[PDB]
Amino acid sequence: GLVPRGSHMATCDHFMCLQQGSECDIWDGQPVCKCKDRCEKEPSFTCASDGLTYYNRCFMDAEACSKGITLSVVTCRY
């Protein structure tokens, strides 16, 4: 438990990542944004602004993050 006095690890509390589906992580002592990529297999089919359909909103967000884009929900019509 010996540490340099007047030092602390970095934390994500006061940072936000604007990219849909992303979250802050600490890498090499600095905040960075990374895609979460973890969702429940709980169906809630979601049509999106790209014209495609997602298993739920979490999967929509994960695709948005993977592509570096923004996807919004639209009504499915049939």
From Swiss-Prot:
Widely expressed, with high expression in skeletal muscle and heart. Also expressed in brain, lung and testis. Weakly expressed in liver and kidney. It is found in: Secreted. The chain holds residues 104 to 172 of 571 of the full protein. Protease-inhibitor that contains multiple distinct protease inhibitor domains. Probably has serine protease- and metalloprotease-inhibitor activity. Inhibits the biological activity of mature myostatin, but not activin. Residues 27-78 form the Kazal-like domain. It comes from Mus musculus. The lineage of its organism: Eukaryota, Metazoa, Chordata, Craniata, Vertebrata. Belongs to the WFIKKN family. Disulfide bonds join 35-65, 39-58, 47-76. The record marks 41-42 as: Reactive bond. Interacts with both mature and propeptide myostatin/MSTN. This is WAP, Kazal, immunoglobulin, Kunitz and NTR domain-containing protein 2. It comes from the Eukaryota.
